[PDB]
Amino acid sequence: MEALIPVINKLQDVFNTVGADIIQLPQIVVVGTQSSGKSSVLESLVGRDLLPRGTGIVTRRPLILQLVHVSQEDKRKTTGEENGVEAEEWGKFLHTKNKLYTDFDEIRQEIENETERISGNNKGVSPEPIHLKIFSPNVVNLTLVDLPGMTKVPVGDQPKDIELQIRELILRFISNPNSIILAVTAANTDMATSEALKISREVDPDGRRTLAVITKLDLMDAGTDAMDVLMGRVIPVKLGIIGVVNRSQLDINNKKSVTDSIRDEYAFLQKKYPSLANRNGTKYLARTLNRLLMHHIRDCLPELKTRINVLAAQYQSLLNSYGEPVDGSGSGSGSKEAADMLKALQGASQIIAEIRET
Numbered sequence: 001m002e003a004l005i006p007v008i009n010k011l012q013d014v015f016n017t018v019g020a021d022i023i024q025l026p027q028i029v030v031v032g033t034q035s036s037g038k039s040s041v042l043e044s045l046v047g048r049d050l051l052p053r054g055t056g057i058v059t060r061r062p063l064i065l066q067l068v069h070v071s072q073e074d075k076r077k078t079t080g081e082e083n084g085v086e087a088e089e090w091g092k093f094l095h096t097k098n099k100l101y102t103d104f105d106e107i108r109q110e111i112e113n114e115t116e117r118i119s120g121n122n123k124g125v126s127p128e129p130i131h132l133k134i135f136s137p138n139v140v141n142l143t144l145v146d147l148p149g150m151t152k153v154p155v156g157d158q159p160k161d162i163e164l165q166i167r168e169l170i171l172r173f174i175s176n177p178n179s180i181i182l183a184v185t186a187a188n189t190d191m192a193t194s195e196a197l198k199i200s201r202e203v204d205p206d207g208r209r210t211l212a213v214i215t216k217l218d219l220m221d222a223g224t225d226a227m228d229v230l231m232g233r234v235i236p237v238k239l240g241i242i243g244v245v246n247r248s249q250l251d252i253n254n255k256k257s258v259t260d261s262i263r264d265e266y267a268f269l270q271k272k273y274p275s276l277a278n279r280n281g282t283k284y285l286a287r288t289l290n291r292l293l294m295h296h297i298r299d300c301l302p303e304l305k306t307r308i309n310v311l312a313a314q315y316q317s318l319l320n321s322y323g324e325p326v327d328g329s330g331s332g333s334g335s336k337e338a339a340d341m342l343k344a345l346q347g348a349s350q351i352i353a354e355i356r357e358t
Helices: 004-012 038-046 104-112 163-172 195-200 249-253 258-272 283-320 333-353
Strands: 026-034 063-069 092-093 130-136 142-146 180-184 212-213 242-245
Touching: 004 063, 004 104, 004 130, 004 283, 004 333, 026 038, 026 163, 026 195, 026 283, 038 063, 038 142, 038 212, 038 258, 104 130, 142 283, 163 180, 163 195, 180 195, 180 258, 180 283, 195 212, 212 283, 242 258, 242 283, 258 283, 283 333
Parallel strands: 026 142, 026 180, 063 130, 180 212, 212 242
Antiparallel strands: 063 142, 092 130
16 A cells, blocks of 8 residues: 555645645644643654754744654665764755755754744744654654644733734644644643634634644642543544643753653553543554544545646646746746746646556
């Protein structure tokens, strides 16, 4: 069976700067607040540190994190220059193309060196996603689209006007009918007022395409647990409620391994939620997400294939509606967009066509 996650992965890369919203690609979108621990969720799935936290302040553009599983025998010569130790894990950024990152702290640096910046226009929000492939024998095949974290308070209850732009960005990504919403909220807070769930009901009134992750189960008050939320008694999300306890900042600084953290996570779930421990934790989360993404992709595959063809026809006609000049130094802004789109649509259709097995 041809794995379909690598296929959409390539489709995501194809519509990198030419606009992917109109394609409506099947993908998981991570929506969370700034203090929800959603960045810890990503790293728990990765297996080690990757994302720049907020020593002072956090990220300002989407990160398409593509975890690609490999055999432990599948390795890479360490670069940039000198030898000879061989790497078991490596990363690739789309903007740097075939450059190889063996030092995972250099990957973090590149994310920093690529997030925000006084580039282009307006202020610090770019809906331009960063594309990152992580090759590892410790990850399951999984792709997540990480969006900038919201404020834990409503937008009106904080001073910065740029928070509106963050809310717009998130809505832009999750209004995609074929997008699965991964809403990350800490048990540390009051669930029925979570900004993550609030903004998710605006595009998905029902819980029909939203999955809720409950983090920081070990930080709840005295004499209080997350039994009702984890039993599915309060939060109106339909793809399931999954509770985890990731590494804290203390643990990261104390260099606690993710293997040791999932061990303690496991012990915690067994202790406090014995009747539910089997359907919670990082290991359960990673693989439910893998299967759900696989099932969701092939459901959308037929309708996605024709949409690329239909779009190509509409774009072709749009250029016939356009006219001149076809010549030399200037295309103009709009006609070049249609031309570049058709090129991407061509590359997209080719990728789909290469899917074998009748």
